[PDB]
Write a protein that binds this DNA or RNA. Sequence first.
RNA 1: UUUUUU
Length: 408
Amino acid sequence: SLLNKLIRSNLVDNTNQVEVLQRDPNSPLYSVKSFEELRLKPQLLQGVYAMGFNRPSKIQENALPLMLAEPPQNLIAQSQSGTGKTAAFVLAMLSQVEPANKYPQCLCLSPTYELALQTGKVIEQMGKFYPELKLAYAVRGNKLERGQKISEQIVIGTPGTVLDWCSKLKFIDPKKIKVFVLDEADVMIATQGHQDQSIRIQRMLPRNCQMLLFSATFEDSVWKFAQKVVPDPNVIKLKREEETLDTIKQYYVLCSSRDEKFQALCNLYGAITIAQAMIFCHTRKTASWLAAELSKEGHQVALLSGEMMVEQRAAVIERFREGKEKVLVTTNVCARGIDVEQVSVVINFDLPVDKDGNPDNETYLHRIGRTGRFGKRGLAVNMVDSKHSMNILNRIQEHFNKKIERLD
RNA sequence: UUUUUU
Ligand SMILES: Nc1ncnc2c1ncn2[C@@H]1O[C@H](COP(=O)(O)OP(=O)(O)NP(=O)(O)O)[C@@H](O)[C@H]1O
Ligand SMILES: [Mg+2]
């Protein structure tokens, strides 16, 4: 019985909430034209409606004409958290595949295991009205009898495994790729992200390959780099005022230590478990420590980090997906792209700093973006442990120019 | 520091 128990206020939100948003010009879900006015193929329109999609979001309306335009043109595009970019590029991929040809024509790169899995599902479900459309997972969990070529028309994978499939394993002839999609593009091409493997895969593609880059964020230099690595691109860039959702409200709690952050969250756990929530940490060790501390305080809790094996990672993410786990202590491995409808609270138990210790503005926006997705109303609570930490948050605040409330 | 290949 407290203010943050007003998660329950969002537990059962309004009758035509999303529809009203898709009629507001100031909404990034805004729709001035129907799906049939985008002139998608019939099987791809059936796939769309089959998912319960009613109206295209801003990014979908604007990107698909640019991506389906003939002859093909590359695209570097930005749209906010939970605005439907996956459906945007999946429709792009499916729209250029010729199912008769039993080899990889369309390749998609995600930064992490779980995002590949998640996106793979959307691809299968979106193209389901092509009986012969098949999807191959170039992900860590997977191993095929060596010496073969995969006969699936669409590959989704993570940078390393795809690189091996396209090189020493010879599973995919990369020269036959028509559409190349980099999801969460900005981290896929940034030096501290997957630049090396990403570019080394790109180099293996044919000259006539359409290239599509999507993300909610494009750091200043990354935007300039993407322009030089992607030939002749159409560009969708946001103004920075547009980058934060009105639908995700941002808080912070002031503390003096890690023990004090543990106690706060302890007191708030009853509220967090009403629906579902995510807690981010700066490192794997703190993730694991937090998990053991919550668990020893008697709270059921889920852990997910990169040191876990894929079997365990796949296990947890599915359990969380089904609401069998209600809280997931995690690292930046889940900062991006993950889409779980019920996650109504995101907690930065550690504030997102970069390698050097600088405020990670991009990661912050992706992290808080795991709540309040496609029109749902969400909540992001920041745990501040020091004065230095308070500064990090204040610099983020005026990066985005979006003030963050204090919580008692 | 977080990810990312057999
Ligand atoms: N036109 C639509 N109508 C209703 N729901 C949609 C529509 N388009 C997409 N969605 C759903 O809303 C969610 C959109 O998030 P998704 O597209 O997965 O991530 P994203 O928009 O790329 N943002 P990010 O968090 O930066 O990856 C998904 O669960 C989609 O199934
Ligand atoms: Mg996405």
